[PDB]
Design a protein around this ligand. Structure first.
Ligand SMILES: CCCCN(Cc1ccc(-c2ccccc2-c2nnn[nH]2)cc1)C(=O)N1CCN(C(=O)C(C)(c2ccccc2)c2ccccc2)[C@@H](C(=O)O)C1
Ligand SMILES: [Zn+2]
Ligand SMILES: [Zn+2]
Length: 599
């Protein structure tokens, strides 16, 4: 209570008129502190992009397409996700498991910091990020009072105290664009949250800003590679002699981050300068190893905001989440590789006094080589161990809390002998042969997921221009990343013919760190395609440009169909034949603008 008390005291004082202890609060593993009356945020479903929907009529039926728009962010949805996923306790790992993890984490941070030194991130760096991604964040960073509030909170952090770094589980709250932009104490709430984000970015942002998890720095990492490079990396891993390629999914990774993992992640502060270490130690102790969280809850008499806390799990919407998840997953997979190799036994995991020297010997002689066999991005991993003993090496993985999703905990993992079947970052990758004989390695995922996502707009209250510009952003992302899917190349051509040529793509198609957003432009898509797949592609030795889309390949028809294509169906042939009519209908509603025919 001495670490979280001031944050709760300030909340309690600000909402003194309705603050109460609700005896029928549902929290079982989070400490519950109190509630106050609040207006309900979120919406029961996502708004549909009318431009994309009109140009993808055969997918109006398709069940996965309908499900993608059913995300519920109201208090009911906030509580549903909370109860089904976040309100659990991860059993403490055994003493031998804790020892191996500690040894591996120390070796791993030392390896990651061999060339780079941690540093503080700055006000202008944060401001520049906000401005390049643009707006309430831009208004906040241009207000001197926002930075003065940041300074006061930093002075508390230097004293080992925290007053306003409270995270929340509400995500995007507005039901219509600008709903809270001019509301009562919205500015103060936003300044405190964005200020907390700034302080975290100041102390831990170096991990992302200085590419600590780049493949060159981390061996296993893929930070800064891009979706268009991930397949090539899996193809390169497939050439390393060894067993099958394993890609186990953890059930709710962020909820399985234990107090032991947090204490191993904190070890990076040992490489910092005294002034940086003091600020990063405040972030770790005050907001990672202790956290104060707001979440809404429906009650018989309306909505309340509950104030809860806990000492483990990975927080809601944090700067260091991706990098720290990548670190801990690299460590966990090295531990699993040691178990597969016979370095760690079941008796060792139970033993606090296990032989530290055999772990150090394996890390010092094989560690880097074993990191090179992996592609790790947050909770996503691909591992090609030295043989298949790894498939049944589950003692440490389960004991560290990283229980695999939807599989009995002692059933052996299933690995893949074809890198093209390996799931990684919600995709799988194909090697395609171009008409000229050159090979491409492309990203792919179930087509219903791509169409379903593209049919969701920024939200209610956005103009037809902003909606059409987001539709154009999805169409152009398809032209650059998923051109090999017949239906997507056709729909992309339809959308780009329906939206005025000089309207610039707005919003974002995804928040994924692997998206480099090369499609966020009004440049010719074939020119951008050549830049990404030919000119800048390090795995393309022959730089001969492709002069027509007729020479940009597709997946084989059978694979396109296995992966969701409607090619071959009557409704799809009817759609393809009558698409100029739907394009014209969109153009008529947009108005007298300059359009280009891409069909
Ligand atoms: C200048 C005043 C700005 C008042 N404000 C803040 C805010 C919103 C709702 C509430 C709120 C209302 C009622 C009851 C309780 C609370 C409350 N209680 N505690 N925390 N929330 C309070 C603060 C606001 O208008 N926003 C907030 C940010 N939003 C975003 O969509 C978005 C994508 C964004 C990114 C970049 C640049 C700009 C925006 C973003 C989402 C989530 C996390 C980060 C960034 C909109 C939203 O989430 O509604 C609009
Ligand atoms: Zn704070
Ligand atoms: Zn595919």
């Amino acid at each position: 209570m001495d670490v979280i008390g001031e944050r709760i005291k300030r909340i309690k004082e600000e909402h003194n008129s309705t603050w109460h202890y609700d005896d029928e609060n549902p929290y079982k593993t989070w400490a519950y502190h109190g509630s106050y009356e609040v207006k309900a945020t979120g919406s029961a479903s996502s708004m549909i992009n009318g431009v994309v929907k009109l140009l993808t009529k055969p997918w109006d039926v398709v069940p996965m397409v309908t499900q993608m728009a059913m995300t519920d962010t109201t208090p009911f949805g906030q509580q549903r996700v909370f109860k089904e996923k976040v309100d659990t306790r991860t059993p403490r790992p055994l003493p031998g498991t804790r020892k191996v993890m500690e040894i591996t984490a120390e070796w791993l941070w030392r390896t990651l910091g061999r060339n780079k030194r941690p540093r503080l991130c700055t006000r202008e760096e944060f401001t520049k990020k906000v401005r390049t991604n643009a707006d309430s964040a831009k208004a906040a960073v241009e207000d001197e009072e926002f930075w003065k509030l940041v300074d006061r909170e930093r002075e508390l952090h230097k004293l080992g105290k925290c007053g306003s770094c409270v995270y929340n589980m509400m995500g995007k709250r507005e039901k219509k664009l600008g709903e809270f932009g001019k509301a009562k104490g919205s500015r103060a709430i936003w300044y405190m949250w964005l200020g907390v984000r700034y302080l975290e970015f100041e102390a831990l942002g170096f991990l992302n800003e200085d590419h600590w998890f780049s493949r060159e720095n981390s061996y296993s990492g893929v930070e800064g590679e891009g979706l268009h490079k991930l397949g090539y990396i899996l193809r390169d891993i497939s050439k390393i002699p060894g067993g099958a390629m394993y890609a186990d999914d953890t059930a709710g990774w962020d909820t399985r981050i234990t107090e032991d993992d947090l204490h191993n992640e904190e070890k990076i502060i040992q490489q910092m300068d005294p002034e940086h270490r003091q600020l990063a130690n405040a972030i770790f102790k005050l907001t990672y190893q202790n956290k104060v969280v707001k979440v809404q809850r429906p009650t018989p008499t309306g909505t309340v905001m509950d104030i809860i806390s806990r000492k483990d799990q990975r927080g809601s919407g944090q700067v260091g989440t991706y990098g720290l998840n990548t670190f801990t997953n690299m460590e966990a997979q090295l531990v699993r590789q040691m178990e597969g190799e016979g370095v760690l036994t079941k008796a060792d995991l139970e033993n606090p006094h296990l032989l530290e020297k055999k772990i150090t010997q394996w890390l010092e002689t094989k560690g880097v080589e074993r990191l090179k066999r992996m592609a790790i991005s947050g909770d996503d991993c691909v591992v090609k161990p030295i043989d298949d003993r790894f498939a049944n090496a589950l003692l440490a993985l389960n004991d560290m809390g990283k229980v695999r999703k939807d599989i009995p905990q002692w059933q052996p993992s299933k690995g893949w002998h074809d890198w093209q079947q390996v799931p990684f970052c919600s995709h799988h990758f194909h090697e395609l042969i171009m008409k000229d004989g050159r090979k491409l390695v492309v990203p792919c995922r179930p087509q219903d997921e791509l169409i379903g996502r593209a049919r969701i707009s920024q939200g209610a209250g956005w103009s037809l221009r902003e909606t059409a510009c987001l539709g154009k952003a999805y169409a152009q992302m398809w032209s650059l990343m998923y051109f090999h899917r017949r239906d997507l190349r056709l729909a992309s051509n339809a959308i780009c013919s329906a939206v005025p040529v000089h309207w610039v793509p707005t919003s974002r198609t995804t928040w994924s760190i692997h998206a480099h957003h090369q499609w966020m432009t009004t440049e010719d898509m074939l020119t951008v395609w050549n830049r990404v797949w030919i000119e800048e592609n390090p795995w393309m030795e022959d730089k001969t440009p492709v002069t027509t889309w007729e020479n940009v390949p597709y997946l084989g028809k059978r694979e396109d169909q296995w992966c969701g294509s409607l090619i071959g169906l009557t409704s799809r042939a009817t759609w393809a034949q009558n698409i100029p009519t739907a394009i014209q209908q969109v153009r008529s509603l947009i108005g007298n603008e300059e359009f280009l025919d891409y069909m």
